[PDB]
Symmetry: D2
Subunit: 393 residues, 4 copies
């Protein structure tokens, strides 16, 4: 909407810096625009409210003498939205300095249990005949309302399992159990300004469904930029820090173009067509654009056993399956151990895979320089010889 992608990215980049970068940021961009950007981001981070009684939390973003006042309406079963100053009972004033709020949302920072904000309970309540009866009405509501808003004003790791039920995406709960693995592999990336590409947005031909996992990744990586690729148009999903791209997963040249434009990627996820040949095309085309230390993730390898997706009944005939790829990746890892051959060159994947993690219906591939060196030729090539050479006479 208002917020240009390069600008959001620049803001996140500077927010991760020290004092000089924070000053630089607020000098480079209008403080009113930045405060607007933070509110939009906060509205996305807030968990569902639990309070039965509608309440207003006032979020005051302060910069020098300027106060950008946002009155957030908070109630169970309604998205948290900004309203007019008079449109409810202000249960809590929450105050942040602009640079502090930037650090909390987009910074590289340590946990801060206190000292980031100021709060005042029932800020506009005057001592009247109505006062005490109004305190009974609102005390719990103000507390719960505030909890929800405060949780949106920071970068505490969300629970992926919970986000999958919240954003309506099949990662955990019924058909799959991916999220605890995703958590283990992804959580160490959360300090970084990651670029994440997911192939397959969701909902298929439905004019409204999809983008659940995309929103999941936005919540999980507070400093990330998420991209979604789908053969269908999913522009209705675009929001702050989420970009949807329309194209074919099995078009390698096109994959190369978008990776050049938007890459390189810390993380690529394949959850698209699940057609076996597609997975192989996507991987060969997109693995070179994963950063060293990044991950390439393949979901739903179950289609490797099925003809309707270009797979095979017999698990042994894994010629062109996604499982065949995984198996071959083991040899790619071990490639420096092959008997020397003056004609053979290690392929690109050979040189660039350093780990493979395989779980039920999900596999993680580690991108890295695979150049540890094979076992020297002067270590004997049979067991009884090795014993002799290792027994120190």
């Amino acid at each position: 909407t208002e917020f240009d992608e390069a600008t959001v990215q620049d803001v996140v980049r500077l927010a991760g810096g020290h004092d000089s970068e924070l000053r630089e940021l607020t000098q480079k961009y209008d403080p009113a625009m930045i405060s607007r950007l933070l509110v939009a981001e906060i509205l996305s981070r807030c968990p569902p409210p639990s309070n039965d009684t509608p309440v207003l939390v006032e979020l005051a973003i302060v910069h020098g003498s300027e106060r950008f006042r946002h009155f957030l309406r908070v109630v169970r079963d309604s998205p948290i939205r900004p309203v007019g100053a008079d449109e409810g009972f202000v249960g809590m004033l929450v105050e942040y300095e602009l640079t502090e709020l930037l650090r909390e949302l987009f910074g590289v920072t340590h946990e801060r249990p206190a000292g980031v904000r100021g709060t005042k309970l029932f800020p506009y309540l005057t001592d009247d005949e109505e006062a005490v009866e109004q305190i009974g009405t609102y005390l719990l509501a103000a507390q719960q309302g505030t909890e929800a808003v405060l949780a949106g004003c920071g970068s505490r790791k969300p629970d992926l399992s919970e986000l999958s039920s919240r954003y309506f995406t099949p990662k955990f709960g019924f058909l799959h159990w991916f999220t605890p693995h995703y958590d283990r592999h992804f959580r160490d990336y959360r300090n970084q300004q990651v670029r994440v590409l997911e192939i397959g947005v969701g909902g298929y031909k439905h004019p409204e469904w999809g983008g659940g996992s995309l929103r999941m990744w936005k919540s999980f990586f507070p400093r990330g930029q998420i991209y979604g690729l789908d053969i269908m148009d999913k522009s209705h999903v675009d929001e702050l820090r989420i970009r949807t791209i329309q194209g074919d997963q099995n078009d390698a040249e096109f994959l190369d173009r978008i990776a050049r434009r938007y890459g390189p990627f810390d993380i690529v996820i394949d959850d698209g067509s699940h057609i076996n040949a597609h997975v192989r095309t996507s991987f060969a085309a997109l693995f070179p654009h994963v950063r060293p230390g990044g991950l390439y993730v393949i979901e739903d390898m179950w289609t490797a056993y099925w003809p309707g997706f270009g797979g095979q009944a017999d698990p042994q005939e894994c010629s062109g399956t996604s499982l065949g790829l995984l198996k071959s990746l083991i040899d790619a890892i071990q490639h420096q151990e092959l008997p020397s051959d003056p004609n053979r060159s290690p392929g690109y994947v050979d040189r660039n895979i350093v780990g493979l993690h395989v779980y039920h219906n999900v596999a993680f591939v580690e991108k890295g320089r695979n150049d540890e060196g094979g076992i020297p030729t002067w270590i004997p090539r049979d067991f009884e010889s090795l014993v002799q050479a290792s027994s120190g006479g």
Copy 2:
């Protein structure tokens, strides 16, 4: 030395609450337990860096009894107990027995202070006496004390550093394993793990070997370590480390030691590297890994070498360790096969492959395959999901 059953029981109770610490110190003689802890501390101290030799007095206190131990600390030598007069005593360190038990073998949070008492230059009566000793001993006492105290706790060691300390080829020259081991193993450090490593080291050399067993002992403060080797390795044995003599290719014998000493949280194969041996040991010992545990295969490079029973062609993997790992991918996905699963099928939940080392996760593989009513064709799936 100390009976294994006793050592394991002490570790068990040290991991409990106040009632268990009482039970422990009433079941066994406090004098006996003190010598056990000191033995442990000796193997736990990092190598000292002080140039001038110093004594750290460790006094272990229980009730009215006070057990005094004098540790000689100097660089290039191992820390060892000596008599009270056999050096300058730079530091007195005092522990309650139950507190020392907690720090060495407990299930405990990190405690930055209040676990001990300390008295510097303890036997220097007069001030003028201490002043003349600052030049010679202040630094030395500080460095010596630092090393002993490191031996008196449970702080996680650096496995890559241990590789160099204990002369094991796990990191730094032929291999680069230790960062993978750290990632996979560190969350077990609380537990009274039982670890089996196949291959003690040294082969037929009469002295060498056991470096990796000493590594695991350091890394797992509450663990029992077992090493298997075809050659006698009795000289490696020490508190919390037992060597077993036998053939990793004898499936009956492996069942025997598994039943005697298991079940294992962790098994590591770093033995002959003969492809068949690797397969025999996996089939025999995998059933004896606890759910949530790990089976680790090292040095799969031999999969490509016929002198180890491997094949030069990676596609001809039917008899190799790599062929096994590939078969394990199918095991993980087994419930996705069209319409009995074997033991391994039902019990593998993760595979991690790195250069020359693979970790296998033992667990109930029973998430359920993709249900019948989900379409088995791409075109069919698209219309059903809209």
Copy 3:
């Protein structure tokens, strides 16, 4: 309901290795243990967020035995055991008894898979007239199962979220490292939401709540309330001897000098005395001197008190302070160190 000493024995054994878990299952009846785990599971489950009511079957298996439990899971209502008839079973969840013990009360690493079995729509015959049921129960069964599964583990909860369901960021900082221990927690001053909060946060814990009023209705698994006078030093010593020693004591200001003097001695070394919300302020200041007492000039006339010898840390925040129990015996600065600045310069310059 369940015998306290038994519950503690179960939790003690659950935190061991294989021989302790088999001891557990031999020592006590597997059906009893089963009801205890379910009882515990119901206390941990988050409030469900699914609109269409669904049943989750929890099958607990020990050898030849199988204990089934059908749990009603719907929004705005607590998860409750029900009869198999009284709703639609959307998910079967299956645990080995010993594995569930490990997950709820064990000392264990995080295990992202392999702890259970799952069968989606466990009792559906064919697809000829049973797709209409698939169309409305798919999303609810996923959300309902997510809530049950969260009750079946020991994932650290959010104390902020627990405060709403039943400030806290400082409690998390100081309390979280204790979570795999079989702690004993005493809260002074108790609605018993606060005790239910610590129960949730300490999966292996025993919680005790002291109050002058009878609060026996608050009692449940791993929560006992004690009734008596918080201003009576002797009584406090007596209940500490009985139920202690405590890893953590939480003392509300709404007094303190009395309860702190009587109870600090019963805090475990490495434990915490927590003071929430004049009287309190003065005590905190003095604790600074208690920490520094080995630095006082010597006097055979003044001798260090219990607290002096036993405090190793003070953490003071807005309306809450944490006092670290431990041996305060590091040694004071030795006499041979100069006691004015100019002399310290000289003696420290080679």
Copy 4:
């Protein structure tokens, strides 16, 4: 040898994403960065443990260029670059420049593999000659490589161990501070911190001091360390450590340097221990501590001793460091200081003060 502004810029860009690392390598000569990283690695290497001396070749690669450094590695000697002919080359270690940047100065997750390339016994032609050298060099090579590689990353060091290594009294004889420092400082380690320690060490002695400065440099891989001392300690200055000469009891002077070098994430007072000095420094420097930062006071023991402006009576605390701490307790429950203290942590002879607005949980008193 390296410009302090340039180093801080390099650390800042290193902690960014791909486009920042590209920017880094365009902005500065890659040769120069190579020397800077090697310099950094040399101070991060633990003491080596190999008996037989060995050479570890560090090759840093950018695009086409290859910068080769040969490091001598032997017990009791510091790792230093020497010619290719001054020993046996045990190991070739190879880094892409931007990858090494990331490993040393980046904001990065832990990477157990794929950050480098390694070639053992790299200049031995045939197999028969290499077998000859197993008995002499293999173990030496492994141990040497391990020491170098330890200095090529950012693994949290052990402060207690650094205390013995760098000769500072923070742990092991007079004090037991380091486990507290570790708990309070460890979460700051991926931030480009600015650390100011009052008291460099060594006093009038012409060589001693700097121990603790080197400690912080080692502990904070992206940090800039500053040390203030009344005496001149210019011999201590190295990459990422600057020493400043001046009096801690000169409020105006402190404000002057706090504006030049601040704001600080951490300030540590281990200076004169004169009680008035401690209170002057705090009042002057606390305003320049960043929100979420720490002010640390060491050696409050002098609060009891008149020779440092203290008092034997713990109740006569009005002008002592203890008295200051006690009034910090008041501020936390309600001057600049009052509105900006959110936490106090007191341990034997060391206190940690948390900086942040004590503005939270306000209620209308009526």
